[PDB]
Structures are given as structure tokens and as C-alpha cells.
A paper describes a structure:
Voltage-gated K+ channels of the Kv3 family represent an important subfamily among the 70 different Kv channel genes in the human genome, with specialized biophysical properties to sustain high-frequency firing of action potentials. Like other pore-forming subunits of Kv channels, Kv3 members are comprised of an N-terminal cytoplasmic T1 domain, which is involved but not required for Zn2+-mediated tetramerization, followed by the voltage-sensing domain (VSD) with transmembrane helices S1–S4 which is connected via a helical linker (S4/S5L) to the pore forming domain (PD) of the channel. Here, we present cryo-EM structures of the human Kv3.1a channel in an activated state, providing mechanistic insights into the modulation of Kv3 channels by the cytoplasmic T1 domain.
To elucidate the structural determinants underlying the biophysical properties of Kv3 channels, we purified the shorter α-isoform of Kv3.1 from mammalian cells and determined cryo-EM structures under different sample conditions (apo, Zn2+-containing vs. Zn2+-free). We achieved 3D reconstructions between 3.1 and 3.5 Å for the different conditions, which show only minor differences in the overall structure, and no clear densities for additional Zn2+ sites other than the known sites in the T1 domain16 (see Supplementary discussion).
Numbering used by the authors:
A (entry chain D): 7 to 87
B (entry chain C): 7 to 120, 170 to 173
C (entry chain D): 260 to 295, 300 to 463
D (entry chain A): 433 to 463
E (entry chain C): 347 to 432
Amino acid sequence: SERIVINVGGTRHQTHRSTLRTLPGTRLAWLAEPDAHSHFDYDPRADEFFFDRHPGVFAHILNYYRTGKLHCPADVCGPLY
Amino acid sequence: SERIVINVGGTRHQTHRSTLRTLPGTRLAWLAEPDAHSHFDYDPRADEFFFDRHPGVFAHILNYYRTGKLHCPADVCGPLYEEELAFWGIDETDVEPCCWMTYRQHRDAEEALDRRWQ
Amino acid sequence: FLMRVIFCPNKVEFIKNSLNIIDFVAILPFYLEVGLSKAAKDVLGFLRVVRFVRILRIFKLTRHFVGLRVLGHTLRASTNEFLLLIIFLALGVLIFATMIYYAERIGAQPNDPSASEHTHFKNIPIGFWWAVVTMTTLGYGDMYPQTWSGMLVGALCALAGVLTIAMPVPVIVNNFGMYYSLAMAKQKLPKKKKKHIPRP
Amino acid sequence: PVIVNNFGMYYSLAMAKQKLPKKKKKHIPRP
Amino acid sequence: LLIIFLALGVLIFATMIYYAERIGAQPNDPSASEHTHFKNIPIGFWWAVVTMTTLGYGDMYPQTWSGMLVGALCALAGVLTIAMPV
Ligand SMILES: [K+]
Ligand SMILES: [K+]
Ligand SMILES: [K+]
Ligand SMILES: [Zn+2]
Ligand SMILES: [Zn+2]
């Protein structure tokens, strides 16, 4: 019950709930809480939350959650990120 | 019946049918309609449409469908992205001004660079 | 000007508009002929200086150009680099002026009563002028060092001027290039029709 | 040009560090 | 853009230098300007081009403190308005 799988635009991003729980107040912080099945899109057959967003930049967002420093991917426009 | 999975070159891109239905007339718009099994490549065992295209740029095409603004990925050549969005039906004159000068650069350069004894 | 005064919505901003200010200042001297003895000479002497601004009416025409708007935005957005450039120039000018004034006096002839007779660098402000002319790689040639120490100081001045001018000017030029590219992009792009109809 | 590029990099980084407001370390690291 | 910038700079600095060089004019001479090369504005155009392009022939140059200030401003503004579009 420590692992959580985010399905962002069809790409499965997997992480521990502690990682999401680091940065409070943000959307993924609300994901990490146990009252998240009702709040967010979720299918119990695969145990994944689905967000209809660009996955390539969510990699860097989740990297912010993991390491603690926010960086900009040099392969997307400024406004996109 | 609201979710649709696109298999683009072996990478599964998943989205809602409303997202595809936003931009009409394009290929993905025709995908979103209920008469799409016959028109396009589709296998019922995995419920995925298969397109034999570069997936890394289809990420940005689908991002256009989702957010509403077309951007150019800075990690592929201008002509590559141009040909991909030409295939997908997207108009090239929709890219945002932030990434228009780098996109329309090589094409600008290319267009600028181009009786017996008679 | 009278036809424009006929319709003047938001007269506060109309008076704050620099273009109309320039128009009025340029039209004042001629119209002051009927208004125009002792004070008249002084006001005419200053009216010539006012008429000097009559050339500023070309900005009324050139405001519609794109490059000039981009240049104005660049200037307004690069104040820090201009301050850096003026500080660098002032420091270099002062230091090299003092250095050249003292260098040119080493080879001074003892016979002449004045400290410096054969050199153009008779004082430091002349050094300021020479330092500007030499650091900008202008080199008029009206004043130049004539002593080996002066020549060394002059070579150092030329090199340091090249460097301290080429420091912030590339930053300013890059700012202008970015602004001009973006403005030309926004001008070229045809008006969009918003193909993407957003979902509710 | 090499010297000028060095100065440009240093000046851009210094202006970035001066502009950025003092952070509060939102990210509370896990033990 | 370059020709417009050059024309504006040349005109403005020519007028400025012509008026600056007359501040220190000697009252004795009947003519307005006798000791200065900037006897009129078109000469100012020539000097402004030569000075903004950092050419600096030296055939004509300011000889008054106000003229020297105007000349320094002319050189700097010429460097900038030439390095903009080039
Ligand atoms: K030069
Ligand atoms: K020169
Ligand atoms: K010369
Ligand atoms: Zn972009
Ligand atoms: Zn390529």
C-alpha cells in the first residue's frame, strides 16, 4: 500500500506515496492521501489514476517530487511547461 | 466507452473521446466517432487503434488536442515534425509564436536558396 | 492640430501623449511672432533653441514602423545593461585619462616653464575626451600620445576599451534580436480562427 | 568572443540569482 | 531598419552638434561660426556618419566641451544602432 501508479496520458508512472506526500497542497499530495479514489479518476481493475496530460513533462514534475529541485526540460517550449 | 487507446508505433496513448472530438475534420476526430472500427486499423483483443508513426511527436500532437495550443518539440528537426503533423491532418500555421521561428527556419532557408551543333 | 483638437477623448492622456507635446512645442515659435523688447530678445534666443526640436516631428511618422517599436521596447527593457555600460565607460575614461596625463609628463622637456608644452594632454579633461575617442576605436587623430609611455598607455586604452565595450553590448543586442524576432513572428502569422473548440 | 561569452554567462546567472525571491523550501524531505 | 536608424541618428546628432558648437562661439566674428568645422547641418550629417560608423577620419571633429559631449554620445549611439540589426 506504499506504491501508487499514475497513468498520465497512457504512460504508467510509479512511485511511493511518501514521494507524493513530500510537497503538500499540490494535486499529487491529494493523490497520496487515502481519500483519493472518489476525488480523482481511478479504475480498480488496474489500480491506476488516469490524468489526460502530457507524460513527458510529468516525468520532470515527478522528478521535482522525488529529488526536491524543480528543473525545466529543454525539449519543450517555455509556455508548454 | 469514453476512453480510447491509440497505439502509435508501439506506445499506448490513452485519452477521452471528447479530447479527440475537440478539433474536427482531422484524423483523430474521425477516430473519436463510433464508425471508426471499419475505417481504421483496430484489433478487438486489446481495443487499440494502431498507427505506424513516430510516437514521440504524437505526444505533442495529442497535447495540442488536449490543451488547445500547438507547440513544436525542440528535440526533433523542423521537417520531421512538419511531415508528422502533415500526416495527422493538423494545419502547420497553428503553431504558437513561441516556437514558430525555429519551426519555419529550414523551410525558409530552403525556399531562399531555390540544330546538331547547338 | 486644430482638427485633432476638435476630437480629444481622454484629454489627460492626450496631453500626456508625447507626440502632441512635440507638436505644440514645435508650433509655438512661429505662432509666437504675433505675441512678440528687452525680454523679447531673450525669448527669441530661447525660441531658436525651441525650434531646434522641429526635427522631432519625424517620430510622428516613424511611430508606425515595427523596428522602432521593437527598439523602444528593447531600450526600456535593458536599462540595467545601459547603466553597466555607462559605469564601465566612466571608470575606464577616468583611469586612462589620469594614466595618460601622468605618462605624457615623464618625457616632458625641463626647459619650458609650463609642465606640458609638446603634448596634447595638458590636463585631465582632455584625457577624458581622448579616452572616449580611443576606447570607442574612433581615433580622430586630433590628440594622440607622443611618448613611449604614452604609447603604452594608449595601446592599453584601446584594448581595454574594446573589451569594456564588447562586454554588455552583446547582451543588449541579444535582447533586441529576441524582441525583433518575436515581433516579426507575430506580424507574419495570419489571424487565427481558433480551430480548437474547447470542451465544456 | 570567448571572453564575452564567459561574461554573458556569469552576468545572466548573477541576475537570475538576484531576481529570484528568497525561497522557503516547500519540499520537506522525507527521512 | 538599418537605413532608418542611421538616418534618424545622423539627423539628430547633426542638429545637436551644430547647436553645441555655437555655444562657445566667439562674439567678435561677424559670422555665426568661424572656429568650428560644423558651419552648417549637412556637414553635421557627414560627421555623424563618420563618427557613428567608428570610422573617425579626423577631417572634422568637435572643439568645444559641449561638442565633445555630443561626440561621445554620437559614437556610443552609433555603435548601438549599428550593432542592432547587423
Ligand atoms: K573602428
Ligand atoms: K577608426
Ligand atoms: K583618423
Ligand atoms: Zn511553444
Ligand atoms: Zn532533420
